[PDB]
C-alpha cells in the first residue's frame, strides 16, 4: 500500500474529483430552474466542520466550473440567514446519519427555500436511522477510513486519498492514550 | 480576461500551488528539528474562517506531501506546548492576525508562526510581518481562492481583481 498507516486505498484524489464532477453536473441541472446568481441568489453551502473543509473547498470550486455560484457557511459538528434561500449541506461522511438528521432539522426551522444534502462518503450500512442524502460522491462499506478531511483523533485529514486505517495505528495510539491516563 | 466579473487574473490556481510548494519546502525545513509526528506531535494549523478554508484545504495536503503532519482547528474572524501555524487567506491591516496570535499566545504554544496566501504589505495599520507569504498584492481589491465580495466569489479558482461595476451595481442594489 502507498501509505505505511493504511491497508487499502479506497478512493484516490483523482477518482473523487471525477465523481464530484459527475455530481456537480447533476446539481447544476437540478438547480438550473432556480436562477442562482452571485450576490443576489447564491446556493448556500453549509459545511459541517471539521472534516468537511477539504471536500467543501474542492466541491465549491467544481460547482463554480459548472456555473453554480455559492456562498459558504460553517457549522460545528461537535454542537450536534438562510430564510428563503436554497441550502445544500455538505458533510465529509454520512454513517449513522444522526449528525445530518439534526443539522437538517435545525436548518429547516429557518425556512430555507429548499434544503438538500451532499456527502463525499456515504456508509449506507452504518445507519441508526433511515436517511438518504440527495447527492453522494462515493459509497464505502462498514470500515474505518481516514483522508480527504476524515481524521483519526484529529490526524490524517490531510491525506489526499480515502484509505482504510491500519489497525496497529489505533491499537498503538489507544494504548498510549490509556498509558497516559494511568500516568 | 477569462471571467466576466474580473478585470484581470493576478494568480492562477496553478501559480498559487507552485508558490505553495515552495513555501511548504521552507516549512518542512524550518520544522525538521521539531520531530513532528501524527497523533503524538502534529503541527497545529489554526485556520481563520471564513475565507482561509480553501487555502487551508490545499495547503495541508501540500504540507503532507512534504512530510509535515498537521491537525486543523478553525477560528472565526489543547495547543499548550504544541507548535502552531496560523493560516489566513489575506493579511492587510494586520488587525485580525494580531488579535488571533495574541490570544493564542495566552495558551503558551511551543511556538506560533503565521502563513498567509495574500499579503497586502501597504495596508498595515500596525507593524506585522508574516513568517510565510505565498504572494503579495498591491492596493487592489481581489476575490477568489477563498476571498469574497459580500460572501460571493470565494469559489473562483484564481485570485482576481473584481470589476468595479460588480460592486458598484451591488452597492447601489443594497438600497
Ligand atoms: N475518520 C472517520 N470518521 C467516521 C467514520 N465513520 C463515521 N465517522 C464519524 C463521522 N461523524 C459522524 C457522522 P454520523 O452520520 O454517524 O452522525 C461526523 C464527522 O465527525 C466530526 P469531525 O469532522 O471529525 O470533526 C470513518 O470511517 N472514518
Ligand atoms: N475579499 C477581499 N478581502 C480583503 C481584501 N483586503 C482586505 N480584506 C479584508 C479581509 N480581512 C481583513 C484582514 P486584516 O489584516 O485587515 O485584519 C478579513 C477577512 O474577512 C473575513 P472573511 O474571510 O471574509 O470571513 C481584498 O483585497 N479582498
Ligand atoms: Mg464533519
Ligand atoms: Mg472525526
Ligand atoms: Mg479569512
Ligand atoms: Mg471577506
Author numbering:
A (entry chain B): 5 to 84, 103 to 205
B (entry chain A): 5 to 81, 103 to 200
Task: Give the exact sentences the study uses for this entry.
For example, T. brucei has three 6-oxopurine PRTase isoforms whereas there is only one 6-oxopurine PRTase in humans. Here, we show that two of the three T. brucei isoforms of the 6-oxopurine PRTases are identified as HGPRTs as a reflection of their substrate preference for hypoxanthine and guanine and the third isoform is identified as HGXPRT reflecting that it uses all three naturally occurring bases.
For compounds 2 and 7, we have determined structures of complexes with both HGPRT-I and HGXPRT, thus allowing a direct comparison of the binding modes of these two ANPs. However, compound 2 binds differently to the two enzymes. In the HGPRT-I.2 complex the phosphonate attach to the linker occupies the 5´-phosphate pocket and the phosphonate connected to the attachment occupies the PPi pocket. However, in the HGXPRT.2 complex the situation is reversed and the phosphonate attached to the linker occupies the PPi pocket and the phosphonate of the attachment occupies the 5´-phosphate pocket. In the PPi pocket, the phosphonate groups are oriented at slightly different angles in the two structures, this is due to the fact that the linkers/attachments are different and the presence of Mg2+ in the HGPRT-I complex. Nonetheless, both binding modes result in the L53-K54/L86-K87 peptide bond adopting a cis conformation. By contrast, the binding of compounds 1 and 2 is very similar in HGPRT-I and human HGPRT.
